[PDB]
Symmetry: C2
């Protein structure tokens, strides 16, 4: 085998803060936390105070692979800018890969060979946050439908050939209410939107992404 | 021109609850809310109580188009299952398209010609929620990197040719701490993760999506 697995269930004998690699390929992870490990998802889990707690992994654990996967379970107790993991060159400070929590619950992965300003990144999608004004749009273009939040593409379904059109002349429309469908399992029937709405707009074509962006300005 | 635009700034003369289409192509939107319109994003905005308030749009506004866009601004005051808009056949209850808010701030768009159980949908991406255990994974396969939350793909960057590899033998790794980069604008330096972590795993290849799913079980 290759790779590692930290289950963080119980310190190794002889210590209070060392946790083994269950795959038996790498050294012990070291925990710096006054909490220690506590009941969590699978047996025990690391609990970090968000102040100065972290885990040191042994050197070399990820720098010898061309392709790879890093995976773990996490319970985020504070929404904000925070490092989740960071694997970096011991010889310089501008060669690294780091997964971060973002200003809003999104996550970002960055790899760079030229410091902070050269990061190549991947960022997760936006969602609707409580009490925060956002722009939403749906576009249908042939078989492809697209969802946008603040002018960013957040989903597609390229298999949409479909209902109202034509004989849509007498179609009904609500904002914030649904009509009664054919199913009592519909959870939206009799649910009413709690919020505010503005500039409701409809177009008889599919706007492009930067067209969408411009509305979201 | 074609299409509509409801700015919801001021009731039309002679009424208390009618709002015109600024494009002058469709009838008045009708508001059912004891709140009326109030200061919002652009001038005034509709405020729905989440109990029984909604807006009726005039019949036909969207059922005569092959391709289209629906776009608006929204401020969601309660996270949960709620209809945002619904355009449906006046002759049956199983021919409609509806945009909904979901259990967690995501949004879903559905079109159907065969009732609730036949909905074809588009759903926005997951994010990390406060106090909620989630599975996260990053995979690098050739030039393509992928982010996953609970086994669902939430971002990619097909242009990743890059840093540690090789000479990665002495690379350093943290969970919950970042090293100091070359920039004082780095907001992650000196930030510490507030949360829990379990089953931290590393692989020297890129797992497939259902492989990822299986870890997220
Ligand atoms: Cl263990
Ligand atoms: Cl108006
Ligand atoms: Na564990
Ligand atoms: Na307005």
């Amino acid at each position: 085998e290759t790779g590692a697995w930290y289950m963080f269930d119980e310190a190794v004998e002889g210590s209070t803060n060392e946790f083994k690699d269950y795959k038996g390929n790498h050294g012990n992870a070291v925990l710096y936390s006054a909490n220690g490990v506590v009941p969590g998802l699978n047996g025990n889990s690391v609990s970090l105070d968000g102040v100065d707690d972290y885990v040191a992994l042994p050197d070399g654990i990820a720098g010898t692979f061309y392709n790879f996967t890093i995976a773990f379970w996490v319970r985020l107790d504070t929404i904000g800018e925070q490092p989740i993991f960071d694997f970096f060159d011991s010889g310089s400070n501008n060669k690294y890969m780091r997964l971060t929590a973002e200003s809003d619950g999104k996550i970002k992965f960055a790899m760079t060979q030229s410091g902070y300003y050269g990061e190549k990144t991947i960022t997760s999608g936006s969602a609707l946050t409580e009490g925060v004004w956002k722009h939403v749009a749906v576009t249908l273009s042939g078989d492809t439908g697209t969802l946008y939040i603040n002018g960013e593409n957040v989903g597609e379904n390229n298999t949409l050939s479909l209902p109202l059109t034509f004989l849509g002349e007498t179609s009904k429309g609500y904002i914030g209410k649904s009509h009664q469908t054919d199913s009592s399992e519909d959870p939206y029937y009799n649910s009413y939107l709690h919020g505010m709405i503005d500039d409701f707009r409809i177009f008889d074509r599919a706007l492009s992404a930067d067209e969408i962006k411009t509305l979201a300005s």
